[model samples]
Target: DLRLHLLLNTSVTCNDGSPAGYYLKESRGSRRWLLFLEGGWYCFNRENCDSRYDTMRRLMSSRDWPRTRTGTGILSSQPEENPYWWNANMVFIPYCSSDVWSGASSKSEKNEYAFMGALIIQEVVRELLGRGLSGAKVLLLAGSSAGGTGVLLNVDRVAEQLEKLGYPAIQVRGLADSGWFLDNKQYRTEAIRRGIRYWNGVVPERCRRQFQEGEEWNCFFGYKVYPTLRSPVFVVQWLFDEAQLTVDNVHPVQEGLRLYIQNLGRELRHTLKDVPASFAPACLSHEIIIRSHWTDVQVKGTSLPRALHCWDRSLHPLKGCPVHLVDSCPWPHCNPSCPT
Candidate 1:
């Protein structure tokens, strides 16, 4: 059995300093927790910020969150509906900051109330730790799109924190859903640098320093930071990511998308070979898990839920099999009858 509760802790704030609380689905007989990070595209300039501020839904604070008495995604309160995760304690974190929850202060922005993304995650984790998260036997950090990128950016720190709080024995894993926003263009680098300076975002200086000649701003991109994650990661992405279709008015044609996927898949397969897992489907759409397609979505006749179930079950102390590469689908192939 499970119960849902909304925590309106005023102490938790978004980038603009409005209250940001999490929705909790408490499990009656389980110590597992699924922490979800909500995603929305970020804003960069005053005009963009103003647009979000006007539309509360776009900004984290002023918006009407979708969480009612019932929840969605990994926080789904319905046991029979999402039986795989129904018994696990679930926490949902909404995103308003445009920095993939990697910013620190509003000092850089001259005309906007650009709050801190990094601080928001830190503060919320502190609050959860106070409320028994320290006792959790399993921690599944998952997010979609911007939130997915946020998971990539912050999962390591969250794992490290859990360990620091004496929960080192707990199993920790992350799943980034459609958050594989590629930074393939040189201008993408420029955009990130501009956003960091504009939002007072502090890229992981410690990680950046290791590069010797690094653009710390690169930390804002998911691929750049994947190698540093302490916990195992399971990345869910589409080869032809529709969300990544156009950036700076550059449309990634079928060929471009194919190449991007090939390169990214190669990198992920090689780098995360021993510590992380991934599912790069051959679709052209975006987002999963929340949709009915989640179960129907399969790679090589194996559904995502099934893949994850098998992977989690395989995690045993005696086996030492920390990674499970489930990329049964081929890269460089476009789904027939793909949407335009």
Candidate 2:
């Protein structure tokens, strides 16, 4: 096993000519597999990144996430099969962008919230796919706090983009810990209602934002394209965690999963026969079952301020790592062929 850290030249150049941002990609390779760990939204800051991304990459591929090397997970197992030598059959591109620190953003920047997140993600995915990393099988997009919000905020679009590449039946899995909830419409309406800045009131003064119009292929609780998606996805998640992270105006990390269970309808929610293999401290699942925000609330009907605070679509309502479910990016528990 080997450990590796990175400070690569991961930069992007947009149409408007903004200063390039950084994206550090660390890859681990084994004889039969290669794993690539995508970092979460940097939240305009950089701390605890290497460990977070590395730990996550290990979940999908045994690439010695703690070690150093080059790999393609199982995606490139048949290297000879793939002249391109890419495709993460199950790509775990969690929210791994230096969001908060992408640039000098703030409410004053007046950046479009929709545009901000989607654009960067577009560039990131495009670059990777260009490198032959067309994770066409099961693309896992997830993140916590701002990162979580980023994945959900633009999940549909990402799916649509990948589908065009012949990834017709991609199983999209997402773990948004302490993510800022609300579809583009509802959240936008909520923002207008609450008079919060765009992107759930995340002031441009803080980071670059996103902005868009119409009801495209987007929803808070995973909506699909009618026949294409039928009903929205009902996910079986683990980690109904406690509120962690102190990022203001953001969804608290621990309870993000539970909130999805509570607010989303039964049609949109899935049942977890068992806890996620990555089950650790984050398990807000009880909150959804009980109708409160915490497990005890499910058991005793109690309410906690922090849990309540995590329910909104505010810029920084809940905070980060609401329950920290980064271990299930490729969603091992949901896979029937999963190994013990």
Candidate 3:
């Protein structure tokens, strides 16, 4: 679910956007963070929305969620007890154990970690300081989807979710395609697929413009944000067709792209033969085909008579902790655990 709580003049209205750059919401008469937000396109959270939804005659009605007792945003309350990954590793548990309040901290994937609220909060702080509210330290954020996009987006949304569910341990598993806004422009094909509908004029153009202003440098993440992003990184790619698995490795990525293109030319000529090593300097083509199709079996539902397909080569259907090459269990280091 994506969380979107925005109006036209967002900067003018929100407390964090106040000239003081901080709006102290005295829920119980103590100053806490002035929760700001860095949202993606749309935020739709159905589960939490149910409790606070009163005005909407239809489920899809657009009602404003100002601070209400039953409103569906961050609630002023004690955080969860068990110290889940978000609190333990990435963020801090709120109120209860938040005395030492670490500063300038946040996280997300390498490509999209900038969604952390601290960065925006700091920006708000900068503005606040300029306006003479330099003592500001409070900041909060929330969202779902890409808002869920960053660990921040509607971070209060997740916190609210945790709070609503009585703070039962929330563990976020990921294989997120936090596609860089610029990267999307670099690959226009996929961009069109993900772009939202407009009245036909500005949507696509708006995407580029938004990226220009909002998302510039790994706009959603950074080292500070992605420190604990070790597990559950579902990198879906195939060097041959998809043309992904890239960042700034100009040498490797370019060569790999080049060889694939050359081999594709051969493939077009009905020649399924491997390109010669002379042509492909790194013969890294193995990584290309073996990527996504690593696992796809066909027994009953295919146009051809029969083919095991990628039995284990299909990237989408990849299993856990791959260790081996063939269809053996516990891939990569499957059969025998790799020696220490």
Candidate 4:
């Protein structure tokens, strides 16, 4: 059973000042760890955050979170369902800070809410070290959507932290699902810029150092951030992302939508060209790692699970397999396996 554990020992509170927490499902004698971060869209400004607190309190506060939770998708404990990672120690961290797990600030006069997403992650790792993470052979920091973006932003930091804590042998990797957002002109970048100011957001240090002042926001985008990531990351992004399309003002019924989607597919392919470990399918969907049918989606005849397994193996001293599986077909929904 996945049991909830609140961070009462630390000052890492959620946006509403409620205690931050995570649900854990431990496997006896297992050294492999998979920590999955839950995703919810963020609110950049005071008005937007206030609206979020009113409408989506659960995402910003942990007061109503269930004591015991069940795992699904990659967090599934069923061997038949999750295959490789079913028996590993699993953790599900709920999104409560509304900062896409990037914030480092606390409650202040300028910001009434505590944006401690990054701090929460560090505290959880520190707590987990006493629990069994210190002996872990592998830790896959995975997430979907904003949580996925969180994985990209924090994976290297987690690795460095582990090394500093004298566990340099632990292999840290990332599985970012549907978080590889494009920096295309179609989507407005102002929200992210404003979010950085409001939340005091922290990007990966290596990626952050690459940009000049006022350009740190570039580190938030996967294409810009991926190059500086030291850990092996398996990126799962649909070429024609539904969330991206929504922000881009493209709808299914709209005129020129097909061409727009095609262009998006091309841009995704180009951006992911150098990524050695990725699975970019020509589907029009959002997240997939948590879905029951996640194993069904394939790119170039390799399913997401298969690609992830290959990525896992590639990290070790073994004959590397093709982890970079992108659909060559340029059209949206071109793959027969794509969800409708």
RMSD, one per candidate, in order:
4.5, 15.2, 18.8, 1.9
Candidate 1 lDDT score at position 322: 28
Sorted by lDDT (best first), the order is 4, 1, 2, 3
lDDT of 1: 0.65
Better of 2 and 3 by TM-score: 2
Clashing pairs in 4: none
- What shift in Å separates residue 53 of candidate 2 from its native position after superposition? 23
- TM-score (all chains, Cα) for each model: 0.80, 0.36, 0.24, 0.95
Total clashing pairs in model 3:
45
Q: What ordering of candidates by TM-score runs from best to worst? A: 4, 1, 2, 3
Worst 10 residues of 2 by lDDT: 290-299
Error of 2 at 193 (Å): 5.4
Candidate 1, TM-score vs. the true structure? 0.80
Error of 2 at 2 (Å): 12
Q: Give me the runs in candidate 3 sitting further than 4 Å from their true place.
A: 1-24, 27-31, 34-74, 79-135, 150-340
Which ten contiguous residues of candidate 3 have the minimum total lDDT?
Answer: 93-102
Q: Which consecutive 10 residues in model 1 have the weakest lDDT in total? A: 317-326
Error of 1 at 171 (Å): 3.0
Better of 2 and 3 by lDDT: 2
lDDT of 4 at 253: 41
Total clashing residue pairs per candidate?
2, 72, 45, 0
Where model 4 places Cα greater than 4 Å from the true spot, the runs are 252-255, 317-321
**What root-mean-square deviation over C-alphas does model 4 reach?**
1.9
